Design a protein around this ligand. Structure first.
Ligand SMILES: Nc1c(O)n(Cc2ccccc2)c(=O)[nH]c1=O
Ligand SMILES: Nc1c(O)n(Cc2ccccc2)c(=O)[nH]c1=O
Ligand SMILES: Nc1c(O)n(Cc2ccccc2)c(=O)[nH]c1=O
Ligand SMILES: Nc1c(O)n(Cc2ccccc2)c(=O)[nH]c1=O
Ligand SMILES: [Cl-]
Ligand SMILES: [Cl-]
Ligand SMILES: [Cl-]
Ligand SMILES: [Cl-]
Lengths: 297, 293, 293, 298
């Protein structure tokens, strides 16, 4: 007898194989900076903006200690961070098997460790996805090269009717972004997956499962949002220039976890002041200190 | 006479944290390759094959794992540790036994050079068996560097490290050539007011005896700024623009080794095997069948 | 009336480091099972099935991963976090919604009890549906604890938290029974000179209102705490001596749940299976067939 | 074409102890349990360190690996280079050399079991002898009451080792081979040629017999004045805790304190040791590290 009287996050920050070698031979791409902070800050900030405090980071055995040195156990930012290893990159859906015990009986969210989002009312858009308790939620975004992604086809009335992974002839230009919200059915859906031609457990197959059951919500992420990934050397450079333009224009940072934790009330002024101290001599610590006196709307 | 090389890829403190919290700055990519490929390339272009890499205690394994012992590229690489960021001149104390009685050269691990006939300009400094050679480059913010003053006739007459009031806009770049005197000069150095053993004091020592050759690195050369987030980005975009225009890579050690005949066609083919699926391996395999002038 | 249980498994900072860097303290074993099984068993022996486990943000998920919802043992387990080690009395504020309008019991996570008819001693306190009930135990070092003073007739006349000059050698143990007032009492409390919401301050409130019952836990009971390296070791040896003599286990939740009829023979059988290869699983299997008085 | 200007790499087998110590180990895994005042894994780590070994590979289950990584990091705080590898299945102690193949590379190695603790006078010197011989293998033999539980070494009348048997029901001697092994460059190749035993495992005893049969096994006696303790049962863990507690409380000195060992080895200096003492200053361990900065201990 069970008794019924929340949502957990996962960041997949595993090995990107050899695609970006030699740039990534020495370290994981999710530890590479995007302008002024490690790539992993961005997806972490996305989970935090969704209200998620308990987060599992999945990385290679080789890179886990570096993530741990960077992020700790989360206590400094009002979070709980746990770690798991992915000995070989067997696909995105494997996160749910690796993370089965972490997830337990809760709702979950998966974000890719190399995905960056930017836009207005983003916090509010993540809230509406995270509050929806049943089924699955994903976001669709108009791209130039939909063949690189999971692609969602829509009927005349705007209802999602099919998902295809990396189709040679996409039915739309709407790619599924690297952020996914799941109810308690996901671990059992993943467990029943069998590997694709590439030998991978595909997230698209998980999402198609929900779709066939009429439990997939596909929200359009509009053109006034930037969804960037750091898939090529050129795209990583563009992403850093994009963040630098916005930050240097505004004097506000994108995806500063200390800031977000503070604005969420997960840490207070006294704790924020402490986090600022060791970086007092550089731009980042000086930003954190300013946060304490300034009202930002 | 033999010249040994030293790459100093030490700690940049908290200056670029949290971007460098996880990993030292010289293991970060500039566009498509680890930042250290660029100084290693500079030394290779100067004809230097025996090279010591000095890094933090934490990062030396990450450099050793990246570069190996060098035999795959016709190099002889060794590694050593700088436990504290106590000055660029410490390189010659750390590297004393490595250097032995040979000629030497020091390059900073975050220094990026681009321009015409770099191979020639290095070859001339490397051939000088006595004295020291450095390069001065016109910059906008000379205060950040070793600043060199010249008399009306163009002769180097003074060096100041990070002066409050620069005597010129000519900064000394992070590439130094030295004869057999440099270890003994470094050994007698005392810490500065900042608490560092200064490369500029080494260079002043050579200067007082008229044995410092200060060559001008002209405006037609790129000495790229890697000191800030803003400038690491600019450098990435500079390399990308060159490589995407030309279809030729800047600072590809495999290619350089191949062109200096340090490895043969069968060795370069084996190096391309692992990267075959990506742009870098494709580049290395194309090198074998194309004449580049 | 139903009584709800709270186990406070609070953070012990870095007092037990590096032992507890490996895993937090109420997850460390006392001889052959996790520390938290003992206070859980105490609650279970008082007839309490609905239990809230409060711990740190980092530890609470590990307790959840160990114990789950308790359905396997006929329990109803829930979890809550205490952000900062800001006093034991915060348990009632953190736990306000869980407690609802019911009576409660609080047990500290590092407290171990052993003795004859402990079951019956818990029953007496469990059924007093008004006021609060605590237990006094004669100890050698009363200064470490909440100390209770008695007068000539053995009536409790004062409570003092870790007094420099103890008025008696009776310590109040880490087990507390409370009525419906305790949440409002905790809400009105003003933090102590130490800067922590004290449980002794909750107990003084009840005392001053003439509503605190102090029962003697006699010398034939063992009350141990496992809060230091030394004390954990001594507790391990004590449990080992009892268990190896008797061939019976102290604080086995499965056994207690089975003997309380909260799970049946079929359920206990299933719980034994995964543990079949060790002494604990063979023990649960033995309990299906053996009569133990 | 190679050049010279020898390094020995360490491996710690911190494998999954199955269910044998459940439910104690449901919460935290075996080599993360404390022996008195520090995690079990500190003891075999300290042993490798005392042998002069700085580059160390830790092999554990996928679930345990990040817990070890959270405890120990990359080692750089203690002047070490710690690496990690996963053991998917409990397929024998010899599997360490296949899992650890690329880590070892062309170097000498040492393998230590995660649950072995050693204590005694100039253990440092004893390990030196073994660490220094750059060819063949070296093991240590120790008189025990229950040789049946271990690999057992038989000696002839002149004290030369003549056979090794794995967990024999009828032991030829009371000399068990302890869980610490030194190997030359041949071990990986010897290990690749092994086949599962009747028990279904790649057995270290088979590796050691291969060296013995080539006359390349050194068996040094670890004498009765050394303590070699096993920490793999509830009773034995508790006995090991009591033993360390008695020594530390008598001496005011710690057994198997990695920070202390790296400081005395000159792998980290006084300033770095002071940094490490900082966060732990609230307890006996940080205060102990602090005291080491001012006290001369012979
Ligand atoms: N995107 C974004 C924000 O919206 N905010 C504002 C915010 C965060 C949390 C709670 C209320 C407001 C940031 O501080 N950083 C960000 O990157
Ligand atoms: N700068 C530069 C080169 O000049 N060359 C040509 C070269 C190298 C060595 C000997 C003769 C010619 C490169 O292949 N890569 C380079 O980055
Ligand atoms: N102390 C103790 C017990 O008395 N019992 C027996 C019992 C439990 C519940 C109800 C009736 C009898 C145990 O199984 N474990 C114990 O630690
Ligand atoms: N066994 C043991 C030691 O011998 N030493 C002394 C030592 C270590 C390294 C170099 C010289 C001396 C310890 O500090 N801790 C120990 O556990
Ligand atoms: Cl906005
Ligand atoms: Cl040119
Ligand atoms: Cl009894
Ligand atoms: Cl000794």
């Amino acid at each position: 007898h069970h008794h019924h009287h929340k949502r957990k996050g996962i960041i997949l920050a595993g090995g990107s194989g050899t695609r970006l070698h030699p740039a990534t031979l020495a370290i994981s791409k999710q530890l590479l900076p995007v302008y002024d902070k490690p790539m992993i800050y961005y997806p972490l900030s996305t989970l935090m903006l969704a209200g998620i405090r308990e987060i599992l980071i999945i990385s290679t055995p080789q890179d886990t200690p570096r993530f741990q040195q960077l992020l700790g156990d989360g206590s400094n930012w009002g979070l709980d961070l746990q770690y798991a290893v992915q000995p070989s990159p067997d696909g995105l859906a494997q996160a749910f098997l690796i993370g089965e015990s972490f997830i337990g009986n809760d709702l979950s969210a998966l974000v890719l460790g190399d995905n960056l989002y930017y836009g207005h009312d983003f916090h509010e858009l993540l809230g509406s996805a995270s509050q929806r308790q049943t089924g699955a939620s994903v976001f669709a975004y108009h791209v130039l090269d939909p063949e690189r992604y999971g692609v969602v086809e829509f009927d005349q009335g705007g209802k999602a009717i099919s998902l295809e992974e990396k189709p040679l002839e996409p039915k739309s230009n709407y790619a599924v972004t690297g952020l996914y919200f799941y109810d308690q059915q996901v671990v059992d859906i993943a467990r029943d997956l069998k590997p694709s031609p590439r030998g991978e457990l595909e997230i698209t197959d998980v999402n198609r499962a929900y779709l066939e059951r009429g439990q997939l919500s596909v929200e359009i992420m509009g053109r006034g949002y930037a969804w960037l990934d750091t898939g090529t050397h050129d795209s990583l450079l563009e992403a850093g220039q994009f963040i630098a333009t916005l930050e240097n224009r505004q004097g506000l940072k994108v995806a500063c976890p200390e800031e977000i934790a503070y604005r969420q009330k997960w840490i207070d002024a006294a704790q924020l002041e402490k986090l600022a101290a060791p970086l007092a001599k550089n731009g980042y610590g000086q930003y954190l200190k300013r946060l304490l006196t300034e009202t930002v709307y």
